[PDB]
Amino acid sequence: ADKELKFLVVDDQSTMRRIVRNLLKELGFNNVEEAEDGVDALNKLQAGGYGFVISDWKMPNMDGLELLKTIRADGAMSALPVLMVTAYAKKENIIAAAQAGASGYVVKPFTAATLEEKLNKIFEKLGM
């Protein structure tokens, strides 16, 4: 994928945002911004230019399933890649996120290799 691809990393825990941002840097992606919940995310997205969203689920103000649904329903951003990265591991959560249009889903805790693999799977699916 294009190394200038602009990522938005959304998680309500600063530790997890730092993990994901650092992993992206190792993969050669430095154009990375952060958000703390779905509302903060949407504000950043409105500003434009984003090419990929990595999102937590459990967050105050707007949770990540609502964020994913909002993105998918909005004409300006309906095709934005959204990778869910969450501690929710139950199949009903996986099903609800998949049905809502998630591009992929990673369960926390996750290894660097898992994040790379799942990002690549999405790049290949979308021809990026």
Query: Should residue 44 be labelled a site residue for ligand BEF when binding is judged by CB under 6 A?
Result: no
Query: Should residue 55 be labelled a site residue for ligand BEF when binding is judged by CB under 6 A?
Result: no
- Residue 42 or 56 with smaller CB distance to Mn ion: 56
Instruction: Count CA within 13 A, CB hemisphere, residue 58.
Output: 9
- Residue 1 or 59 with smaller CB distance to ligand BEF: 59
Range 21-26 contact pairs with CB under 8 angstroms and sequence separation of 24 or more: 23/112, 23/115, 23/116, 26/112
- Residue 77 or 107 with smaller CB distance to ligand BEF: 107
Task: By CB under 6 A, name the one of 35, 57, 97, 105 that touches ligand BEF.
Answer: 57
Name the amino acid, one letter, at 20.
V
Q: Kind and range of the H or E element at 120?
A: helix 112-126
Residues interacting with Mn ion, by CB under 5 A? 12, 56, 58
